[PDB]
């Protein structure tokens, strides 16, 4: 599954339809990024640039020109063909092949952008630009506007209005096309296979980073080269650190390990968290905490649908958590009073759900307290957790337990579809899986 | 093998010994780097900061103060302990534990650097600073100096002299300690195992990125989490692109695949290139080119020693290449005339050797044309190659062949030691290895 | 004559009336400007900031908030009262006295602008900002918008639209109020008195800068402390340099001197040019060139009215010039052919008229080739000139003559009023004036 | 009196003599500075650039190259001749005439500085640069060094050492040549004539700015076009503001007026303060304060010599002031106790003396508390004052009195020479001067 040229074009046209006549929208590529000295990190295209292009080169700018209500056209600035640079560093699309390949009207050399951009903006009323995202892009846009402002003797005029296109584009990204959902479904499946592998490979004495290695190999083999974020493998007390990425410790017989990891497949993020016993068997204390977190997730999965909200579902999770913690003596008092004082917060200190898409923490307006009413086409994580610090004032057997269980869902007309349920989460199914692997 | 606290301290003292009395040297940590939106790439410490600290956190500065010829001391600025930030993002060393852990005299909060740095530089004659490396560091240094310059009413004085410490530090890095060599030896072994695995796993129909996956898994399993540079897997015509990293094509029965890949182990780079038949058997045309490149490498390995140079050894390689290409009809004319016109350059367009260490293209002065006389303790790559473009005006059977074979060596008193010779390169040994794997 | 508080308020309200509901307009003060080391040039307020405030302090920002179609209010950021700073450097308005004194609703300390501005912009749809004028202002605006963009967890929202208020404000400035015209009338009178003094004081052997001294003293004595631009006193060949400001030469018996100078009175520019004989008597060659330039000005003064344009009047001047130069043998050929080839351009290389107001080259749209149709309330210069270079290929007696004669006019319903006609320009009246002064 | 080409050359050579072999010193011109919109303030050359060149154009850089201990040479970058730019804006020296005119070895176009500077610095050990003075200069220097650092493949090398030349150059500027003293003597005389004129012109009902007008006219007529700093004319309570420059009030019969003003003559500052009765007659209260300030100045003038210090002389002034204020009942207590508690500070809150030269607050090291031992050739102001605030808790008749009296002196082998004593300061001589003028 992928996103095709025709869909990138549909997105460009949908933006244009929203644009004022006599306007241009500018979308800039991500800069290349130094890792050390002359070596660079593997390139990651800007999500919004990617969303409108499917083009994975730096030094590129998409310009959408809406001349008036019927006439519009696109111009790509991108790197010129250059035999020597390409022998050294890789092939470039160039100007001749770009219009056909990407579905744009014209292509120009990025080296000419300062000579050409002001000419494209001349006489327009509005420029749509995401100011403050990249410094290099701001310099280019501001130089172009300065040329026009100062060029009245040359009969040049600057647009007087600049509009941030991000609110509108991010609203577009919040509602996935069926094709986007198919890509996310594959991302979820790939990520699930990786987490299943990790459970099946995990043994006491292995290092946390070994499970990261298994996960990343599995992503790669299905054609998801890179993770969507830095893989978290938190065993024992490390599971109480939300984004623990050192992954440097030897995994101990008797500890849990919390794995939070996701692939990036055609630009789209998977994100799964599973927590399981390193030795294949939950202790009673671990199982008692696990059951509360699992009930939280299972209830959320039942509830998520059009017409509810992350806030409303969060309210149910909080009650499940407070009740469970009271039953175990981790909290003390009256459940409703405890809820009213947000007494769960020491143990569950993050949100239940975030949007998911081209970014793992995806774009889109949440509403105050994530109160926004859910609609079909929205994609989100569901990731309840409980983290009992090694020094917490709680019954001793619970100290140093960090559990999170996370699935990715798409809201549908009939509820939600779970994209990641092909990796097990019921404790008996986790145990059976690991018992089977441990017998091989 | 690793570099210990005591060695980081020896390096700090060696720098201090080179510093003028009444001076301070400032070494800044690498900034964290955005991958997309709020996600960051996995952190890579600045090589020089790492060289003097072994400390893998951002928002840190090492200050070495040489008060005079007998008195000197160190101050680390680093992130404060912060319960909430650490629950979210990971543990911090903090100020209390830093002196003992790193072997510095004092530690201060990085948040206080602007209030404290000028006070440390006040009244000194010289500040050692690597200007133009990081913008954030330059702002900090320039602000501190401006406070002092403008603070005579407060009896403050700025050093009048700024010296770039990089020439001296990079000369230090050019000569490896025995401990550094042991770490590089392990990096070479780990990288070799990965390349051996790739040859043993490779089959027609697999994608280039699959071999990258095998390689990276093998790095990880020996505790080298990250590559030292972006892995190159160039099959067929892709082998003619020096840094081909798309690794997106299906590998064809009948093509060669060139793999250029290396781990980063305790900060140090491995870098191996091996080229081999995708189907386990060189064609005659492929073997004819391969033999020239192999002779180039084998001769270089025999020759490299104290008292020669990369330039001198390059001269021998060029003769081997020109002679071989004439014998195959790829070049035409008299060998010595061809050499005099650098007729090999279309086919071998890069250098034979670069320094290797904390960076894959490591620091240190090469001399004009890499003429510098080699001495024990220097570490370098040896990476001859021949690249025949798919449209080259040469006998047709050679078109689209790209071959590189690269080992990592350390110069010793008796010659060189080869750190990477545990992965095969003789064509008959490559074939035997792949034949054996292909029978399983 | 001045501009009162009530008029500054009328201007603020007129801008607000043009603003979208749910918007804020930001107008920043000019930075103070270094002359040398710790000394600064005398402060000049930003013209647009001045236009809306009449407030002559740095470190100030006017914020006009249009909450909706009926509710709006103003906030001034300005320097706090500070006993020590004021003992040293002068009185400050402060926050307590500002609302009454300036006619704004609220005043806040400029030191609090970064803590307060984002709160004022929060939840607005539009911010009106003149981007690229001052770097410091851009930093403030961009920081505020970044706080809001990144502050959704705090329920903050950034306006998505930024509009340059300059096109609208500069259109306001292009049409003078009767009060503005009265101030300009006084500026013109003051400037005229200064030019009359210069003619009456001028003698051979005096330096060009001496006439600058007389002019500036006369400005000062009528309460116009500073010139509106750097005074030009170009004698002999120096008169052929349009903005000659060195004013360093001894004025020679037999040469002309061209004086281009104007006061700044309550923020408004005068601008007069007069050219006259240093020794009080035009030579024949000088008088021949002078008469053409004078006819140009006199004809322009007759023609300027509502419904014509600078371009149309320029066409008449060009014909007068080409005809006159042909008659003197400076040009050769047919007048209409000469006009068609813009043959006057070597000798008259600048425009006839520019707008005049708070800036000497005042703001406002000219139209292509200054074709805009004139309307009552517009104020402009009329400044024909002829400059014959010392090496020009023309009859020898004309070489090194530079003559410009300039008046300031306001377009009225019945034509124009001449603000500067109280200093003489007819050659016989210049001579009579100087003869009289030279007898004292 | 002026500074000639030969002296600028002597200064360049003296700097070179202090420079390391294998080094270059870079001295940049001042940027042009906006007054409003497209108008600029009259150009003021950077003092240090001026000190080494006598060249009053922007877009210029002096490069002093010391190749080794015997060979050195100079290169000027400056604006190219350009017929059109010069017709518009004034003559340029250009490259052809610069070597002879300024006494430099070579001249290059400023537009070529980025193509040429790195080539001049290539292979040098040291670059002398005043970092943080001008942003544009820092960009140029840092770009050049970056080219060299990154240009080893082109056999380029950057100097590793940057030294601030300001400490050494400012020490040079602190000790005036006889020629510099002659120029300062003329500046002092010109400034004195201006202050004498102000006393002779001053009448009740005139505005403070009128005296500024008289002063500036007098500067101009002696060929000092511009003041060395913004003229202060503080009458009544305004005299208690140290740098009162509004000069906007009507001067009242019965008030004092404090005038602090100085010309700039060939780059060098005069600085005189005189305080006198607006109506020509000190009241008793005014005379009582005046006498203390005058005794302070007269004693300072007697004492200043080689071997004392500003601090030591300040101690004498403080005793005179405390004693006088006790005698008048403005202070109460024991003189020595009052001195020990710095009880004079409310009334005398600034220093007694600052260096004087190309800047009014001239460069040079003062020592802690201005303790530096005075030597011949140093030039300084002597400016005691007493300022009694309108709300001070003191006998009522003293409120709103601000008096300062300032002369400029040069330290000599036999004491000091007073450069400004040709304007009167004894109260009876002030009165007699004004009585005489008031009878005309
Ligand atoms: Cl390009
Ligand atoms: Cl910190
Ligand atoms: Cl303030
Ligand atoms: Cl130039």
Give an account of the 3D structure.
Chain A has 440 residues and is of the alpha+beta class. Chain A has two domains: 1-173, Creatine Amidinohydrolase, Chain A, domain 1 (3-Layer(aba) Sandwich), CATH 3.40.350.10; 174-440, Creatinase/methionine aminopeptidase superfamily (Creatine Amidinohydrolase, Alpha-Beta Complex). Helices cover 38% and strands 17% of the residues of chain A. The first copy, chain A, has 13 helices and 18 strands. Chain A has helices at 5-18, 47-53, 83-89, 94-103, 113-121, 135-149, 166-174, 178-201, 208-221, 284-303, 310-327, 335-340, 427-438; strands at 23-28, 34-36, 39-40, 61-66, 72-78, 106-109, 126-128, 161-163, 232-235, 256-261, 264-265, 268-269, 272-277, 379-382, 385-388, 401-404, 407-412, 415-418. A six-stranded mixed sheet of chain A has the order 6-5-4-1-7-8, sandwiched between helices. Chain A has a three-stranded antiparallel sheet with strand order 9-10-13. Chain A has a three-stranded antiparallel sheet with strand order 14-17-18. In chain A, helix 6 links the parallel strand 7 (126-128) and strand 8. In chain A, helix 5 crosses helix 6 and helix 8 packs across helix 9. The radius of gyration of chain A is 25 Å and the shape is elongated. The two termini of chain A are 34 Å apart. Chains in contact: A-B, A-C, B-D, C-D. At the C-D interface, strand 2, strand 3, helix 3 and helix 9 of C face strand 2, strand 3, helix 3 and helix 9 of D. Bound molecules: chloride ion (CL) (4 copies). One chloride ion (CL) binds next to loops of chain B. The PDB classes it as hydrolase. The entry lists the keywords Proline-specific peptidase, metalloenzyme, pita-bread fold, hydrolase. The assembly is tetrameric.
